[PDB]
Design an enzyme around this catalytic site. Structure first.
Site, PDB file in Angstrom:
ATOM      1  N   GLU A  97       0.846  -1.180   0.000  1.00 44.68           N
ATOM      2  CA  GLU A  97       0.000   0.000   0.000  1.00 44.68           C
ATOM      3  C   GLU A  97       0.890   1.240   0.000  1.00 44.68           C
ATOM      4  OE1 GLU A  97      -2.906  -0.206  -0.572  1.00 44.68           O
ATOM      5  OE2 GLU A  97      -3.695  -2.095   0.186  1.00 44.68           O
ATOM      6  N   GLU A 127      -4.116   5.056  -1.322  1.00 41.43           N
ATOM      7  CA  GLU A 127      -3.036   4.194  -0.888  1.00 41.43           C
ATOM      8  C   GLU A 127      -2.486   4.621   0.465  1.00 41.43           C
ATOM      9  OE1 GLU A 127      -3.628   2.228  -4.673  1.00 41.43           O
ATOM     10  OE2 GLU A 127      -3.563   1.867  -2.521  1.00 41.43           O
ATOM     11  N   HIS A 130      -5.052   3.146   2.797  1.00 44.17           N
ATOM     12  CA  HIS A 130      -4.784   1.720   2.868  1.00 44.17           C
ATOM     13  C   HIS A 130      -3.580   1.398   3.741  1.00 44.17           C
ATOM     14  CE1 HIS A 130      -7.036   1.264  -1.242  1.00 44.17           C
ATOM     15  NE2 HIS A 130      -7.787   1.770  -0.281  1.00 44.17           N
ATOM     16  N   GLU A 192      -2.928  -5.462  -8.836  1.00 38.62           N
ATOM     17  CA  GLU A 192      -4.290  -5.380  -8.316  1.00 38.62           C
ATOM     18  C   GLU A 192      -5.263  -6.229  -9.133  1.00 38.62           C
ATOM     19  OE1 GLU A 192      -4.527  -1.128  -8.965  1.00 38.62           O
ATOM     20  OE2 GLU A 192      -4.098  -0.691  -6.858  1.00 38.62           O
ATOM     21  N   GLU A 226     -10.328   0.263  -4.112  1.00 39.59           N
ATOM     22  CA  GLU A 226      -9.622  -0.375  -5.212  1.00 39.59           C
ATOM     23  C   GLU A 226     -10.485  -0.570  -6.453  1.00 39.59           C
ATOM     24  OE1 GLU A 226      -6.364  -0.973  -5.597  1.00 39.59           O
ATOM     25  OE2 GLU A 226      -6.232   0.207  -3.766  1.00 39.59           O
ATOM     26  N   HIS A 229      -9.602   2.190  -8.689  1.00 37.98           N
ATOM     27  CA  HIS A 229      -8.258   1.998  -9.232  1.00 37.98           C
ATOM     28  C   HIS A 229      -8.280   1.028 -10.397  1.00 37.98           C
ATOM     29  CE1 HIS A 229      -6.447   2.989  -4.993  1.00 37.98           C
ATOM     30  NE2 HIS A 229      -7.540   3.681  -5.256  1.00 37.98           N
TER      31      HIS A 229
END
Ligand SMILES: [Ca+2]
Ligand SMILES: [Ca+2]
Ligand SMILES: [Ca+2]
Ligand SMILES: [Ca+2]
Ligand SMILES: [Mn+2]
Ligand SMILES: [Mn+2]
Ligand SMILES: [Mn+2]
Ligand SMILES: [Mn+2]
Lengths: 510, 166, 388, 388, 510
Positions: A97, A127, A130, A192, A226, A229
């Site tokens: 992260e 991030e 995270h 990811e 996410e 993302h």
């Protein structure tokens, strides 16, 4: 005089215009690809709205943690094996992260379109969130759990063991070191889209099965972020799909990115899930074969062939390693348990059956070895035995892949036991596959990571642990352990008495 | 023919619909209060519907009073043309001159039966509730337990029907 | 299924009993404080410190790191993932920094979210209260829409100047602060646009297009030198600390504070404009919040570093001189905006006083911290030459 | 211990097993919507309505009630816990009202809390930014500390006027709105004091004591008639609806809106005061929020009641006439404050314009809803009469 | 030029003066007591700070509810008996909270000191929060529970049964109807202090024991607020302790207040706890004794001794009529189960053993009766039997106390059996104790509440239920049930076939 306000989309509509042109308005980072300054982002957000949607998620998350979950004693009613597993999972993911922060900051610098920069900006902030979330899981399990050690200092105790090195490669250096587009793929297009997102979910599943309601509470929240993302993942493949260079550099970087991630996560996540849990959820093999195939290497990567995107040429080889790699690895992780910041357990009887049923031949190989190690007294401190000794006795050297940092025992492995040893300018380098080897051969200067054996050479085990603070607060007991029971915990002296002295396995070669 | 909708209520609704004048309606309201409200009601025959019926009756009186009265009167005169402040001060006077808690409760209760809005304006009425209530409690709660049940029953003038006590 | 298919270890009798049976009588270590090994900045360790310090995997060869060895994968050529080579500044420990406000992600988005939701409520009340009526048209259509609007590109540029730092910062505490400093700047730029978009809704004929304000920024005279400084700070500085320091401890402390506080904040009210001051209240709150962090990093930590105090002051002193000139130029060109104002709005004396305020604050808050010998008179004098 | 001694039915294997065994295969009714029987004001039922409508145990004899029978315990004398007798207004259903903002307790304290925390951040930035420097001393020490300070007792008095309504309101939706209307007023009064206490900290010699502003309120001439109206609305009105209506749809819509918006909000900026406008931004947001609820109850619900529309308009029309007078007097006395201002601050023309704004807004938002024939010129003329 | 601000404490330093004296600056409510305008409040809060501390509590609460608890399916994994019990507990307490709002608004009007007014104001807003919180428990169990009916419409279905009437007396009319000081005692000095609070805690305990984590999450939050109303409880006894009237009226309103409250909760609460649960926490007999003695009637009241406050003269009586009160009441509640909005279950084997163990003699009386009813098929819709019939057949009349509205059966009760019947101006009145009788004899106009037998006289059971919407969604199956199983639920028809027509029991004395 009727009540009116202005929302984010109404502001975002003019964001693309924020950037203006000037001679030096260009990226400060080296990159083979050119990002079109006309690129748009999928979500029309502004700092204010981003903050709000994230705050609402925090409310629920922390509310659950500090209130109901604490009242239910959720930090304690977790299986011992899982409490340990989360020390590694949470902290290792924490660095993934953290590095994603710097990596997206680099992507933000690379993007020229204000909207593409804005998309990455949101990610930079996600991030960080995270990082802080993974940190909170450890923080919470340390405050309310059955064994705080490891949870309370993983950031410094993680440096003792070999598993940590490979983590910095796929989720740290692989994220920020290299062409921004190469780092983009290591993080988003593969990291990811292929592992993290399906992984985050899986972790919540394995966690729930083992009594852990803390991790699901946080990780499910991380997943929601996410999601953006992911949608922002194609944005990077779209802003270059046109540039001629992309049509001849894309596949190469994508291949390495894929091998890099796979080489490490394939064997490690599966290892933590199957050997670090009491209640199983699904064999890693079919969990993997799904992610890489029925979810990525087809129903995901095939939607980009219109940009010159092909299939990972190392996809075939990689497949031949998700079946045995994690098993090859727990052998080594347990064998070197005194080097971790967590407690490990030998497969019990019920587990051996599961293993043998889901991976035929598991017993005649790993099973018989584990039985022997217990006969040697590996769980009992007074035995004067550490599985490492067994590898020496039976002449099975352990090497570290100069590139991926993945520990491997080619003489015992069931995965890619193809050892390659090279000498170059006064130094020896050991590889475990043809892929990592080409990487080092072409980019020598990118891979100089010294391994534990090179660093620990000639040092007595006990001294390394003591030096790197691998002890519990009583200053005498080891954080790491070869069993997960409440008594008969090994102490520093128990290890010293073994008088184990590391040696660089590669030095036997003339 | 249940709790919220029954023949009795329907009957009074129609009855109320034929009250085209304030004097009539107001007088019927006061008569209704004397007949069906408070422990001193002349009858308990409408016990299950009087509260609702009364409200419906008040509705008519309020509407008529608003159309009949001029602003100042609607604020200061009762539905019967009486000066609200007078009635209030008068009744408060009698209350303070009350000899005992028995005369007091009769003053307060009757006050409610005769002037409860929409007869008297709410402002004066509640001002009255405030003063009358204070006096009544003072007298009632003085040596509240001295008089034994046997005698209190007689003072209230109740007819003891049955008693049990092991 | 009312109950469901997934059996959870915490609630499933069978599984839970297995779990409970394997538990130890008591915790295996009484030290339940994550980050216990971190040196507290204050009395007791804070959640902010626990969750942040040492998240960055630096090895000992990068001041303050706890790990060992080289990075696993580096850049083509050999450049390290993070390295001392990315900044002139040196320290004994890059993890010494502490955001005085102790902001980790949760507290940060919480505060900004409250601001966002309040802003919404404000605008809805403002428009419903019809307060827009008492606002000067000229000031609204010319100074707010064009000149204040153009300033957004200034803040946007400063935001972008943080990009490299997000990538190069040598520690978590610094990276996080850097990130929040830049995020607040993009926020302000967006708030400037939010106001223009708001006016467009309650003022018929008001164009929310950025075309005009952008044109003013890209080709105007008022912000010419400002844009030139911004362009440099953002794209001509590759040192993450020089960028952060020069942006917050020089350019924005002088030019920014003047424009925001000494021009628009000071004059908007005079034209019946209480709308703009609402947003400047935020920018100013943000500026003061970042200032505390900026001071701690460059003065308390680097400027007063036990071993590199003298060295670092020399560098920042150098940087201050390097960027002070372009900043003065930015202010000078900005002086031209006063000629545009309606006669009587303000005079040369007030202008000079407001200038002295910005400079005097700057000297006490920044320049004096590194012993940079600043001459208030000379600086002010140079700027006033810009008065058309 | 680590596991504790208390066994919980959700996690204890043995207890949880017994519970699970006694559960039905599926829910015993698929209607999982609490409050399904409530008539939605909007498309779908809201959490606000579900959690609020019918909480009040009214019996059918109180318009809209769902229960039956008399109250179990009444007042000495016979007065009902709640009854039609506590207000002149009549309706077909007291549960028709809906706060347009749909505020139940949670959303309410959440919004105010955000405001509180932002306010704190604001003041800290304001003082650190030293913005106080550019503020006129006379305006600060005389108008803010004395006249603005005195106004707090006006808002405080309006707050207290809600006390009886909190007790007498005939429904939950109304009681909750009433409560929030009054709570916002005490908040404002406290915010006025917060500013004085703030000034006392950043301005040496500034007395935060309320003695002065109180004296001005109790014995001054500027607010004399205002105080007289306040005292009446609060202590001379026993009808919870007359109080709420007259306070929000007459007195505060006229006097309050003028003082807050047309005097201090309008002039503070002219004296370099952006501090006070920050708090008035709240009072104005609050006023506009309460206005929507006030309109829905007295106009949409009562004023347009299917059976008592005509009746209720007569009453409110009556109430408007009753309180329009004392309010005009309050405004008149307030005109005297303009004379205390420094020459040139504002002229009779601006005053008149600001007056017309308040009145015109009042006529459009309230007076016309009940067909109250208001004469803008005559009203403005009357308030202007006692002009300084 | 340092960063400074101002907090609630600093602004509240001047709130006391906010009020100014004048002509009619006085209470609009009748009261025998005079509240000193110099009174101060224990907490120095302002609207802003009040809102903030309350919002922080909401975050945790709703966070737990909407997130972790929902994921754990906490709304479902609760014992059936408890799911039902919470329909009554939450909604009945909801009205107590709601009337507390109006009552404190009245106290706010009564107080003359700005600080005492401010203390009550905080409470007005707190009670509103509690109304909404109790409403949320029902709302949540309706949305995610095993049986929504009752939870989803208690506000209208609560009107069918007799237990509801007594609730409006102690927590509604007793809270707002009468001298503000009398209402103050019914709410704070007795209601909240003696029952409400220790009760809130107890509920969370009984809830946790029966798998309910929803109620603890909310009620524990309500308690925190109440810990403040407690401190504000003495404030009312201090602002009058001086006035001569207080030394002649306090003790009387307090004695009546105490009796009024305990008259209802002593039986109802014990009943709800012991009979609405599966798993037990503590025998009500021992709970009541502690609450009403070592706690309230002892410690709490004893401290007020220096203000004149004397222990209720009805304290000896209350303890006498208490032992069996709740048990006696359940027989009645069950017998009239069709008039409820919740399902009831009969004691199972372990429970009867528990009851006998804790209340010797319990079995020979209540136990045997329940077995009799069960064997005769009271749980079966095809038996044509509801316990009400058993009372009629065995000549055990059920009356409703004209004052407390509590149902009582003298000819069957193991507890109090005294009954007093009078006739006054054409109306009969039934009483269950010497205190309520006194209250009525002296205050006839304060007590005219019609009872279910009066309102339902002559009506056939199934018709009253239908008219008042005592049905589930299918428009046929009753909300109320005589058992908590999922099959063989009673329908309207099953009831109509019984041909039960209500009678006003008092007329048997004509
Ligand atoms: Ca050699
Ligand atoms: Ca120029
Ligand atoms: Ca001048
Ligand atoms: Ca000089
Ligand atoms: Mn992430
Ligand atoms: Mn990501
Ligand atoms: Mn409460
Ligand atoms: Mn309370």
């Amino acid at each position: 005089r009727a009540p009116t306000s202005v929302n984010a989309q109404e502001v975002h509509r003019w964001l693309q215009s924020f950037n203006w042109d000037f001679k030096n308005n260009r990226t400060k980072y080296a990159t083979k690809y050119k990002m079109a300054n006309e690129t748009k982002e999928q979500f029309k957000l502004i700092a204010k709205e981003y903050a709000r949607m994230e705050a609402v998620k925090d409310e629920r998350q922390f509310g659950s943690l500090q209130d109901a979950l604490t009242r239910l004693n959720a930090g304690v009613r977790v299986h011992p094996k899982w409490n340990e597993t989360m020390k590694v999972v949470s902290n290792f993911l924490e660095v993934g992260e953290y590095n994603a922060i710097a990596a997206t900051g680099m992507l933000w610098d690379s993007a020229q379109a204000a909207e593409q920069k804005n998309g990455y900006l949101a990610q930079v902030l996600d991030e960080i969130r995270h990082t802080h979330q993974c940190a909170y899981v450890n923080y919470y399990f340390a405050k309310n759990g059955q064994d705080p050690a490891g949870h309370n200092d993983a950031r410094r105790t993680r440096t003792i063991g070999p598993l940590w090195k490979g983590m910095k490669r796929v989720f740290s250096d692989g994220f920020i070191s290299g062409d921004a587009v190469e780092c983009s793929l290591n993080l988003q297009l593969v990291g990811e889209a292929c592992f993290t997102n399906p992984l985050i979910v899986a972790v919540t599943e394995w966690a729930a099965a083992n009594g852990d309601e803390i991790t699901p509470t946080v990780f499910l929240s991380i997943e929601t972020d996410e999601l953006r993302h992911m949608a922002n993942g194609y944005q990077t493949v779209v802003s270059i799909a046109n540039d001629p260079a992309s049509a001849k550099y894309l596949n190469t970087d994508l291949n390495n990115a894929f091998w890099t991630q796979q080489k490490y996560f394939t064997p490690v996540l599966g290892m933590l899930f199957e050997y670090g849990s009491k209640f199983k959820v699904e064999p890693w093999v079919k969990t993997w074969d799904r992610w890489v195939y029925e979810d990525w290497g087809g129903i995901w990567i095939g939607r980009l062939g219109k940009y010159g995107v092909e299939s990972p040429r190392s996809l075939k080889d990689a497949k031949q390693d998700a079946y045995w790699a994690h098993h090859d690895l727990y052998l080594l992780a347990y064998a070197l348990w005194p080097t971790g910041f967590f407690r490990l357990a030998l497969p019990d009887q019920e587990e051996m059956e599961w293993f043998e049923a889901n991976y035929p031949g598991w017993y005649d190989h790993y099973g018989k070895i584990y039985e022997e190690w217990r006969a040697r007294g590996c769980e009992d401190p007074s035995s004067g035995f550490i599985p490492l000794m067994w590898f020496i006795e039976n002449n099975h050297p352990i090497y570290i892949d100069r590139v991926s940092q993945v520990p491997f025992c080619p003489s015992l492995a069931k995965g890619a036991s193809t050892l390659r040893v090279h000498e170059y300018n006064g130094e020896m380098h050991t590889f475990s596959d043809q892929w990592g080897e080409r990487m080092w051969l072409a980019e020598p200067e990118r891979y100089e990571c010294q391994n534990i054996f090179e660093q620990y050479e000639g040092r007595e085990l006990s001294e390394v642990i003591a030096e790197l603070h691998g002890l519990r607060s009583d200053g005498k007991t080891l954080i790491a352990q070869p069993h997960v029971r409440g008594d008969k915990l090994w102490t520093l002296d128990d290890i010293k008495r073994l008088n184990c002295v590391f040696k660089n396995p590669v030095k036997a070669f003339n | 023919l249940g709790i919220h909708s029954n023949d009795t209520r329907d009957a009074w609704v129609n009855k109320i619909a034929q009250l085209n004048t304030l004097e009539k309606a107001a007088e019927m309201l006061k008569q209704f209060r004397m007949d069906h409200t408070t422990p001193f009601r002349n009858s308990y025959e409408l016990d299950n519907d009087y509260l609702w019926i009364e409200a419906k009756l008040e509705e008519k009186v309020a509407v008529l009073k608003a159309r009949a009265f001029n602003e100042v009167d609607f604020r200061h005169k009762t539905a019967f043309g009486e000066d609200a402040k007078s009635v209030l001060d008068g009744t408060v006077a009698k209350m303070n001159a009350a000899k005992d808690k028995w005369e007091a409760e009769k003053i307060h209760i009757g006050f409610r039966q005769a002037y409860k809005p929409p007869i008297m304006p709410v402002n004066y009425f509640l001002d009255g509730e405030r003063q009358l209530g204070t006096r009544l409690m003072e007298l009632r709660n003085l040596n509240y337990y001295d008089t034994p049940l046997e005698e209190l029953r007689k003072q209230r003038g109740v007819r003891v029907v049955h008693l049990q006590s092991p | 299924s009312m109950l469901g298919e997934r059996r959870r270890g915490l609630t499933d009798p069978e599984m839970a009993e297995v779990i409970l049976k394997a538990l130890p009588e008591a915790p295996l270590d009484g030290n339940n404080k994550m980050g216990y090994f971190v040196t507290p900045r204050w009395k007791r360790l804070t959640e902010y410190e626990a969750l942040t310090v040492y998240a960055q995997p630096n090895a000992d060869w990068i001041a303050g790191g706890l790990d060992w060895g080289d990075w696993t994968q580096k850049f083509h050529g050999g450049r390290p993932s993070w390295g001392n080579e990315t900044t002139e500044l040196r320290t004994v420990d890059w993890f010494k920094h502490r955001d005085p406000l102790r902001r980790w992600h949760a507290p940060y988005v919480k505060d900004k979210a409250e601001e966002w939701r309040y802003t919404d409520r404000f605008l809805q009340g403002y428009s419903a209260d019809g307060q827009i009526r008492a606002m000067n048209p000229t000031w609204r259509d010319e100074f707010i829409n064009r000149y204040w609007g153009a300033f957004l590109f200034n803040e946007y540029g400063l935001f972008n100047a943080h990009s490299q730092g997000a990538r190069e910062a040598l520690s978590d505490v610094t990276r996080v602060s850097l990130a929040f400093w830049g995020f607040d700047k993009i926020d302000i730029a967006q708030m400037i646009q939010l106001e223009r978009g708001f006016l467009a809704k309650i003022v018929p004929g008001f164009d929310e297009s950025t075309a005009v304000p952008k044109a003013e920024w890209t080709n105007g005279e008022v912000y010419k030198s400002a844009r030139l400084a911004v362009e440099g700070l953002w794209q001509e500085v590759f040192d993450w600390n020089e960028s952060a320091f020069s942006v917050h401890a020089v350019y924005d402390a002088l030019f920014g504070q003047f424009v925001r506080r000494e021009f628009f904040q000071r004059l908007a009210p005079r034209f019946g404009d209480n709308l703009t001051p609402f947003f400047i209240n935020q920018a100013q709150t943000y500026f003061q919040i970042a200032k505390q962090g900026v001071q701690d990093l460059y003065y308390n930590c680097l400027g007063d570093d036990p071993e590199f105090s003298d060295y670092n002051r020399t560098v920042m002193r150098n940087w201050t001189g390097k960027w002070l000139e372009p900043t003065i130029a930015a202010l000078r060109d900005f002086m031209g905006l006063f000629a545009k104002l309606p006669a009587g709005t303000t005079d040369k004396e007030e202008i000079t006083a407001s200038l002295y305020r910005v400079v005097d604050d700057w000297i006490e808050d920044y320049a004096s911290r590194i012993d940079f010998k600043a001459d208030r008179d000379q600086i002010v004098k140079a700027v006033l030459a810009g008065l058309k």
